[PDB]
Design a protein around this nucleic acid. Sequence first.
RNA 1: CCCGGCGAGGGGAGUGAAAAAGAACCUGAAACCGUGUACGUACAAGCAGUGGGAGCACGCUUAGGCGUGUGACUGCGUACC
RNA 2: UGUAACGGGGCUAAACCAUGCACCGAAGCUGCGGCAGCGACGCUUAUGCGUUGUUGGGUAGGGGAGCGUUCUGUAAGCCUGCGAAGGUGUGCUGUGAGGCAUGCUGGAGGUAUCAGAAGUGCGAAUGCUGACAUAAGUAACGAUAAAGCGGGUGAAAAGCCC
Lengths: 110, 56, 142, 103, 150, 117, 17
Amino acid sequence: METIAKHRHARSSAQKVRLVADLIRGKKVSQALDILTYTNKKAAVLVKKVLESAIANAEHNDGADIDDLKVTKIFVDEGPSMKRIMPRAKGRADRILKRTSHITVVVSDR
Amino acid sequence: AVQQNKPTRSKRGMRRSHDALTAVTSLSVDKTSGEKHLRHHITADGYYRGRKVIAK
Amino acid sequence: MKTFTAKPETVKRDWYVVDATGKTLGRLATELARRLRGKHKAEYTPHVDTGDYIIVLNADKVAVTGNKRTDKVYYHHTGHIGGIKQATFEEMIARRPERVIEIAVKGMLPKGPLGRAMFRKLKVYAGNEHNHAAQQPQVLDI
Amino acid sequence: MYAVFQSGGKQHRVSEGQTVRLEKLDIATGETVEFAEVLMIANGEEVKIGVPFVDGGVIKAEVVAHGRGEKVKIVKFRRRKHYRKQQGHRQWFTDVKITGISA
Amino acid sequence: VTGSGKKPWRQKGTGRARSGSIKSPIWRSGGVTFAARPQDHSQKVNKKMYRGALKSILSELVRQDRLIVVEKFSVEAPKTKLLAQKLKDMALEDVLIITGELDENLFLAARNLHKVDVRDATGIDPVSLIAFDKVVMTADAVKQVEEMLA
Amino acid sequence: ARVKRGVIARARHKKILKQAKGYYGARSRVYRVAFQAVIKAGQYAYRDRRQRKRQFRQLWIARINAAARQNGISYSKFINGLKKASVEIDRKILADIAVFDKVAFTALVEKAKAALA
Amino acid sequence: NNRPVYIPRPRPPHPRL
RNA sequence: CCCGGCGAGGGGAGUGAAAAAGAACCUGAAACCGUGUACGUACAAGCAGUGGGAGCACGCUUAGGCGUGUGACUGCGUACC
RNA sequence: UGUAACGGGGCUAAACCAUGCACCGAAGCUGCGGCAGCGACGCUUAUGCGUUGUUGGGUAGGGGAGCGUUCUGUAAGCCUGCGAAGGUGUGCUGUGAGGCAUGCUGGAGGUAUCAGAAGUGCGAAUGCUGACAUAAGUAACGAUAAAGCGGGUGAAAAGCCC
């Protein structure tokens, strides 16, 4: 089954979250969950929440037996960026980009 | 002090090849409560080596 | 139709033994480069290594005409502040007699991955004995 | 069992019952053509040309197609001299199948 | 273009291209290098050339039998239905009716007919003759044409 | 009558980028660089349409020279013998014969030797 | 996005080779 | 209805001709950033292409090739204005 | 800076002089196929040529002939919700700018032919506007007056409250 689950407009940068995503790609949900539980990154708790939601969606809207689920696909895409002005020396101004991202997790039983 | 040509995405990825994180993959199971925890660390509920150490 | 091109998988390579005693260094080396490149075969292809394995014996017995035995100088740089080192023909023969023959062949072959590949076929020995008797190395008179 | 013949300014080596592409010829697509200018005929026994074009050797061939070749793009460009030119070419070809080779 | 002539920035020192005004044509929101102005596109045509073209057009309509001459063409009442019937039995759908004298009765009947036009001999133009598939001229309308064409 | 050039410009850029397919980096992605790459490929293609003819000519001569020497005659002598014997076989066929039909080549060198002598 | 620069710079010893 | 912090965001359900029409809403190009698949790449020097070209992976009629993608190796080749 | 005054290997002939016969060698010449300009003639006479000879590197520049885009008439005609424009691929086609058919998205406009008028074609102008890269997950996080612990609240506490 597809049972996708995504979290859009995460405040974390796509690059930073993408390191956490590569850790759990292709692994079973049981091993993915505790891998994220003991990863010391902010992106870890963002991805873990998405993974929890995906498992819940599969259990409720689709077939049960979430024990044999795997994270078939997981990817992070750059989202809209917020432009901010930050003063610098000599009356100079520069643009600060608050980068967001969309985290998409796909789990399946086959 | 500043670049003469913008490095490609190929060079950018090559430099980033060493930034990959590593999973702990070393989760031990408590002797009594059977709770997964980091090695040489107390469990979430407050167990270590079987005996409760936090009592809270 | 399309011109024939040798396929590296389906290439037969023979083994030969050349005695390098009393042979002019350059003229012997020129022949070796021709065999290693495979130019002597009717299926020669510039981008395919069609050459044959050559064993050279008695490298230290190679001969040079004129005063080249004492005037010939081999220079090599070590990539340092003043690391330019020179050796005469006698000094090279005393140190490593096989290297001089390899150096001669090295410069008579094309430069590139294919040139290095065909150079690896050459096997130069200082003595009169070789340990390649399992390859059926037929004697080549030249 | 093959022969060598000269057709369109360039020689071809064709075996029995094979299709060969050669320059355009003033022959309709459904007519046999003759090639009496046989440079060499090869078999189990070898016969050469003491005089060019053997003595009686001929080749029977049937026209198949009269198509045009793949498009070739010709680009002429002069650096810094404000001169660029483009062109295209499709060479006419004739497919012919060899039906018979004489002796 | 609404704006001011002040230089956007100083000639020298700035790291950007020299600029003279916010209204330059190579700038956004203001420009148009060669702005159009209201102009008259009418062109002169000689009287003889106009007459010659009109004579040429009339001759070829006769040659292609696209011109039909009939007696007086009139409608008893100002009704488009009557005019449609009168043109239906004549196998005409796109016709230009040219009459010597303009009568309101015929003018009103053809007003709501797009494919049908009613005109006077004086008010005749080359485009109308070319455009319309068939031209019907009354006997009176014909006579005035030669007099004006001469 | 204002004219917008968005549609035409996008068509031209797509055509160039399509011809630049397979190039590395910006040469296959960026039009400014792709246009230069496509033009240079055009010059090389025109030039190499002529180098190909001479490159194959050299290859045939090398093959004939190896085959002729294997039969005991130099290339220059072998070609001279054919001219004396009035043989119009060109290098392309000669190289092809040497690779495949050894007996036919042996007859040719024998014919060339007879003409020279 | 203009951000005019009003930063004058110090006059270094001119090359005057 | 479910995951979530009585969130944000999302998966179902329903409305609708259409929800990759969900209000960040018609069409949705390019630069730029990603995941998957095929091929190549860790002894090889340079405007990165072009000519020749093995191997591999896909399909086609035939059983030999033809096409598509990649491209070891090799000749020539110092961007544009 | 490093052999560094044959391009290198290397050569005592693979150097030099004299003679000779071979071969390699360019986009030159020839052979084969195709296109275009110009001048003739046999004949078509607003055009092919059973033909003939010759020409076709090119900047500044002069001459000739064309493609495509928006709008006007032709056109209340024609195509189009069993699918227009646009977008994105593929396959044919012309010496060229281009054209034609079609898969998927799209959702209601488009326009033959022949003429007419141009805000009619962009890679550069330290061009203008918007978007997005690079350096880079790098420098920095703004006075070196300084924090530590317990409890509380909370999904989460070094920064909040006690």
